[PDB]
Coordinates of C-alpha atoms (C1' of nucleotides) in Angstrom, one line a residue:
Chain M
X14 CA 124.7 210.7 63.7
X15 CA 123.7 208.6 66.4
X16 CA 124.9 204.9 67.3
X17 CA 121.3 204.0 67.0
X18 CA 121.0 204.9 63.6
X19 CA 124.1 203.4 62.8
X20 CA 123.0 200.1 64.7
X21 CA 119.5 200.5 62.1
X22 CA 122.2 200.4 59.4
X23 CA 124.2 197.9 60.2
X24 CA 121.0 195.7 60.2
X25 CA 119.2 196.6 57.6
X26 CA 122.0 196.0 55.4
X27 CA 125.5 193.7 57.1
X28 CA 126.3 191.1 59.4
X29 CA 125.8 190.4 63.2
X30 CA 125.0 188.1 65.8
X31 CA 122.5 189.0 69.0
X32 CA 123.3 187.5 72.4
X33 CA 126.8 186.2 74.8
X34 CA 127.6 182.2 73.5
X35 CA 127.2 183.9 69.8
X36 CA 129.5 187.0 70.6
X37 CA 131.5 184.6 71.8
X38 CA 132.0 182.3 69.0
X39 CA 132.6 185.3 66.5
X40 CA 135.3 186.7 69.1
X41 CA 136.9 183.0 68.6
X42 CA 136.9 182.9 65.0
X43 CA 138.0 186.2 64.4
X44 CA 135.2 187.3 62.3
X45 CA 134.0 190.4 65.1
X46 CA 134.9 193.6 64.3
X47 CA 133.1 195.5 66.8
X48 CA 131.1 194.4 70.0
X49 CA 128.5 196.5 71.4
X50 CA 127.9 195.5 75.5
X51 CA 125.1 197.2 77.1
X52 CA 125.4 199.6 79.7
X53 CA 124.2 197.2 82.7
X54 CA 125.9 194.6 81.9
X55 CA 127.2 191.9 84.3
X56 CA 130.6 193.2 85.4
X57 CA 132.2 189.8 85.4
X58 CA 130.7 189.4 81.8
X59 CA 131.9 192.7 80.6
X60 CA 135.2 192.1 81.7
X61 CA 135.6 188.9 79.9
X62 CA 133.9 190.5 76.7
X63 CA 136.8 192.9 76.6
X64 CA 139.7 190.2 77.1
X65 CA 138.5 188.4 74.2
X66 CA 137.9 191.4 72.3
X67 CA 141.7 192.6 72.7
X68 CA 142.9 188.7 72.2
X69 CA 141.4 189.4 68.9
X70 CA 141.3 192.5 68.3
X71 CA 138.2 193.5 67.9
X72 CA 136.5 197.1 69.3
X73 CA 134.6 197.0 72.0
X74 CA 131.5 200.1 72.5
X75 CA 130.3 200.7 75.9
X76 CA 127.4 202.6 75.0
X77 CA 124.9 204.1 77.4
X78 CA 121.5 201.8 77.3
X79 CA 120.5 199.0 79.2
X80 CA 119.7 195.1 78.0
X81 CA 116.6 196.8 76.8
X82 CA 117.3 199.8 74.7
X83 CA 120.1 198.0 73.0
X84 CA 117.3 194.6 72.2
X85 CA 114.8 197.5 71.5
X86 CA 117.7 199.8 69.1
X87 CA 118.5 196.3 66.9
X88 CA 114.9 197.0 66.3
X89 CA 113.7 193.0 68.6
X90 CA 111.8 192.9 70.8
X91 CA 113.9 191.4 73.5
X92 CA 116.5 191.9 75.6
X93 CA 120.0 192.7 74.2
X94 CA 123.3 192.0 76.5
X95 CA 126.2 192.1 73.7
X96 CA 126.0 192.5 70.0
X97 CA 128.9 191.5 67.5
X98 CA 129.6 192.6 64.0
X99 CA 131.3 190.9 61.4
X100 CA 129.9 192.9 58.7
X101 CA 129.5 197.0 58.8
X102 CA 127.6 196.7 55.2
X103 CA 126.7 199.8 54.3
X104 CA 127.3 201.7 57.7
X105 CA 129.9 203.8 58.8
X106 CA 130.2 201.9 62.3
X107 CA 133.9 201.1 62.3
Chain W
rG1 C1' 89.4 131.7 91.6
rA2 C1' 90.1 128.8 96.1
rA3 C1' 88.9 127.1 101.4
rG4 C1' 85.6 127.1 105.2
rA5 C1' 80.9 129.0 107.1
rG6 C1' 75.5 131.5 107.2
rU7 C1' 70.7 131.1 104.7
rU8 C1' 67.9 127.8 101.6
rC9 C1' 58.6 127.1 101.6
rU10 C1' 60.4 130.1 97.4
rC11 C1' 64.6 133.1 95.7
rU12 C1' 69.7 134.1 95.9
rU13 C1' 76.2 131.1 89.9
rU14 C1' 74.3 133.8 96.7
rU15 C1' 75.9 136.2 101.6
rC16 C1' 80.2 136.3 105.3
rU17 C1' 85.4 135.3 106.6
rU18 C1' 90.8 134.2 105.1
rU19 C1' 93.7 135.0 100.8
rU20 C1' 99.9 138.4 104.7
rU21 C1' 105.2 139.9 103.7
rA22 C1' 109.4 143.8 108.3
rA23 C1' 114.1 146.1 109.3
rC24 C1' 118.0 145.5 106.4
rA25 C1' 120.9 144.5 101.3
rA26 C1' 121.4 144.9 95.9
rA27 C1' 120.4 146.4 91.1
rC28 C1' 117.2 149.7 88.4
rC29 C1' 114.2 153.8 88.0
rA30 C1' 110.1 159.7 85.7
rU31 C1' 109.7 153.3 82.7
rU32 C1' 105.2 151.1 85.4
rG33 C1' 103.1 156.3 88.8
rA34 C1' 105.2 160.8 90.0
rA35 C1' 109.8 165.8 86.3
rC36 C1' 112.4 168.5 81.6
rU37 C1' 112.9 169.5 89.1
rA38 C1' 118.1 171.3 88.8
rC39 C1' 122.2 171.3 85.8
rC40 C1' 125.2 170.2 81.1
rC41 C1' 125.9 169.8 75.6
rU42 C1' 124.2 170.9 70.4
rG43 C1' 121.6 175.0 68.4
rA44 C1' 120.1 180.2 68.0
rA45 C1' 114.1 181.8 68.6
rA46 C1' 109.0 187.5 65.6
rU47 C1' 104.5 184.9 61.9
rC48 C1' 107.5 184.9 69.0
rG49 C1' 107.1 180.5 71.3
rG50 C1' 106.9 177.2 75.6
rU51 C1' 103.6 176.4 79.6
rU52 C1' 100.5 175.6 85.1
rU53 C1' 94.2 174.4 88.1
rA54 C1' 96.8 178.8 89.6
rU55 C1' 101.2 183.5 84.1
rC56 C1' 105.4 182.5 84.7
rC57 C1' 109.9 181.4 81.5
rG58 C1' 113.6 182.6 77.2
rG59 C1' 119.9 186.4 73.0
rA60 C1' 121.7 186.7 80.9
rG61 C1' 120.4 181.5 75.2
rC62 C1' 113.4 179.8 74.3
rU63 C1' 111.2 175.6 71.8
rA64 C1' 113.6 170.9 70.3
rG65 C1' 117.3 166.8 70.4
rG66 C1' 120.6 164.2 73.7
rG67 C1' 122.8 163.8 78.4
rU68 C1' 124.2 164.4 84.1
rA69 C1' 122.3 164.4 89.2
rU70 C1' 118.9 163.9 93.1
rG71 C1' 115.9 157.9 94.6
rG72 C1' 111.6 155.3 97.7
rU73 C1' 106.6 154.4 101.8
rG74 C1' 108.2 152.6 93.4
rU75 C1' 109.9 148.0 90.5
rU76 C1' 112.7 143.2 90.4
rU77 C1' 114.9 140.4 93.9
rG78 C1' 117.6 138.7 98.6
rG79 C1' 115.3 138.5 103.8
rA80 C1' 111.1 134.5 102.6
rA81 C1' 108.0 130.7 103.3

RNA sequence: GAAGAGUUCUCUUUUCUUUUUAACAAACCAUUGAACUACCCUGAAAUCGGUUUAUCCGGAGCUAGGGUAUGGUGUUUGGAA
């Protein structure tokens, strides 16, 4: 299976947060399994994204997509730079 | 409104003139006119919303709420009656 469909899983049924200051705050607390970051990602930003992710570790996804496939793969209609999951639900993501 | 003047067969509570406030200094300031202009914090937006005369803006963080800065040929005064 795809990521995708995984990504439509982990939606439909589980846990997640959309967007940096939110990733952030889940990195923090502990709570993120698994960050997705979007393929053009700021390079600064992905750097960052992956110390806090091994702070806490937490996996981190570089999967290929820009900001737009990976708002448009959540299934919104806007622009996607970094997803977190606290929750797989019913997917086999982890 | 006031002071003076013009006209006045008739009419005209009339017509005309004067009724000013600098550099500089201080405190405020989007109030009273012009800002959500830029930035920050909280928060996390699809039933998408905000918004200009001009359609641009937002999960790279919208709307909203509260802040910070920029400051006069603005205000209140000193100067200054």
């Amino acid at each position: 299976d795809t990521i995708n469909a995984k990504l439509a899983l982990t939606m439909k049924s589980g846990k997640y947060v959309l967007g940096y200051k939110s990733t952030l705050k889940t990195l923090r607390s502990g709570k993120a399994k698994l960050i997705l970051i979007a393929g053009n990602c700021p390079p600064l930003r992905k750097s960052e994204l992956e110390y806090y992710a091994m702070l806490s570790k937490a996996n981190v996804h570089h999967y290929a997509g820009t900001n737009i496939d990976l708002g448009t793969a959540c299934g919104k209609l806007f622009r996607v730079g970094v997803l977190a999951i606290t929750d797989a639900g019913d997917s086999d993501i982890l």
